[PDB]
Structures are given as C-alpha cells and as structure tokens.
Amino acid sequence: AYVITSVDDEMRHNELSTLEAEMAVEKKAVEDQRDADLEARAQKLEADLAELEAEGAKSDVRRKVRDSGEREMRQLRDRAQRELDRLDEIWNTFTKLAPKQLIVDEVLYRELQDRYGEYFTGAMGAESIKKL
C-alpha cells in the first residue's frame, strides 16, 4: 500500500475553490448521463411492451420482458452510482489528505496522482519510512 509522505497545505487551500468546482461539474456530468441513459431505456421498454400489446400477448411473457427491462435499468443506475461513489471517494481522500495516511487502493492513488499529483507526494517501501 502507498503512504502519503508530504502534502502542500497552501496550494491545496489556495486552489481548493477551483477544484471543488471542477469536481462537482464532473460529478454533475456523470449524473446527466445517468438520467439521460435511463429515460432512453425506459422509452425503449414502453416501445417494446407496446409491440407485445399489438402482437399476441401473454400475461407471463410480458412480465418477464418487463422484469428483464427493470433489471437492465437497475444495472445502469447501479453502475452510475458506483462511479459517483468513487468520485466522492477521490474528493474526500484529497481534501482530508494528510501525511502518514494510507492509500491501499491502486486506482485511487493514481487518480490522485494525475489530478492533484502536484499538491502532494507518496511512496512505498522503506524508502517512504525513511522520509517520514
């Protein structure tokens, strides 16, 4: 696991307003997609169940198609929610970033590296302990 060896408090504070803005906009951009994908899928559902209404319809057949559509929609929302939870995790970890903290998640650390990598430093192994 990685460890936070150093953090720049001034730089984090001075530019905090801007990061918080860019963060919410990205989080909102994901939210717009979620709702946009769900409505298109629900319109597809209503269209498909309508074909079955025009065609021959069985109360049990339509239900499994219905049940199948609700399942796909639940998959779409759950995946979008995971993306949001990860995004909130990135921001929370960054604001509360402090030396001696532990970042066990590989993807999270390098996400903190690409964006915000200039505000802090981290390492692994005895090299990191020597720094602390």
From Swiss-Prot:
Coiled coil: none
Oligomer status and interactors: The RNAP catalytic core consists of 2 alpha, 1 beta, 1 beta' and 1 omega subunit. When a sigma factor is associated with the core the holoenzyme is formed, which can initiate transcription.
UniProt protein name: DNA-directed RNA polymerase subunit beta'
Role of this protein: DNA-dependent RNA polymerase catalyzes the transcription of DNA into RNA using the four ribonucleoside triphosphates as substrates.
Full-protein interval shown: 133 to 264 of 1317
Similarity comment: Belongs to the RNA polymerase beta' chain family.
